[PDB]
């Protein structure tokens, strides 16, 4: 017949449950802004001619 | 004003023509008002004549002015 109301939610129940891992807390407020400012403008020297990636990923497939 | 109608007994209608300014368009439009004025039997105005009127107490339902001069 014209489709099924069943199968609703199929993928959410299919997806294996991966627990969210525990990490140390991050600074909040001004400290977090200071932490981000250090990485962008103080942790490295800018090399012109190549853009800067803030979430560069390891190679795969 | 200017006399508009002279068909009532001892009463006349006058017209006050003026330009009203519309702010948005920065231009004028022609407008007029009509007033019922008591005319004493000492003036005998004609349609098209121009008169000077003065405010007085209500003399009828629509009359609030009296003819003071005819030009």
């Amino acid at each position: 017949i014209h489709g099924s109301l069943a199968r609703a939610g199929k993928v959410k129940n299919q997806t294996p449950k991966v627990a969210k891992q525990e990490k140390p807390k991050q600074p909040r407020g001004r400290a977090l802004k200071r932490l981000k400012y250090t990485r962008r403008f103080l942790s490295k020297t800018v090399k012109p001619g190549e853009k800067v990636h803030m979430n560069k990923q390891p190679p795969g497939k | 004003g200017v006399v508009h109608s002279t068909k009532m007994h001892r009463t006349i209608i006058i017209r006050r023509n003026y330009l009203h300014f519309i702010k948005k368009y920065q231009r004028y439009q022609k407008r007029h008002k009509s007033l019922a004025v008591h005319c004493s039997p000492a003036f005998d105005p004609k349609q098209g004549d121009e008169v000077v009127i003065g405010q007085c107490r209500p003399l009828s339902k629509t009359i609030r002015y009296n003819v003071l001069e005819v030009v």
């Binding site: 001004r30 400290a31 802004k33 981000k36 400012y37 403008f41 | -």
Partner: protein, 183 residues
Amino acid sequence: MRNYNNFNRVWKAPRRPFEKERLDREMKLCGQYGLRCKREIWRVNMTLSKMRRTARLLLTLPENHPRRLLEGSAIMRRCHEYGFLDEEKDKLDYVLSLTVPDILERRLQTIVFKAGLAKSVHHARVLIQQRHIAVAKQIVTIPSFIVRVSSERHIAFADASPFGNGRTGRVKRVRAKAAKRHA
């Protein structure tokens, strides 16, 4: 109901939410001046926009206009007293050229760090928030305190603070109380 206490907003959000040129420039200001959030920058932006708006209106009027003579001298007195401009720059045209860092430099957070009371701009903010800094012998706990040039020399450690003439702080007080009670 029947309450007539005025209130108004002091900041405005940027029209374009994601501009890499503006985001990088504002992040540079946030980390250099130790600001908590972007609202502090935008609060300064609103202040700068008000003064420039008034200056532009005054420059339209002729020089002899009483509004230009009165209101024009008032704003320059404000710029000179708070250090936004310089005494040498005594024309309304220099109000138009004011920049955001100029106001940011006059903040108590920047002044304390520049004066040497704190070894970092972040040290200055926490020191001010911890009632260790006094301006003209008055404790100020507001980092956004705009310091006048006249009161710049009167900034020092608070009388009641352990860094000035006050009693001992927290860790020393509890330790001595711990040392006494442990007997």
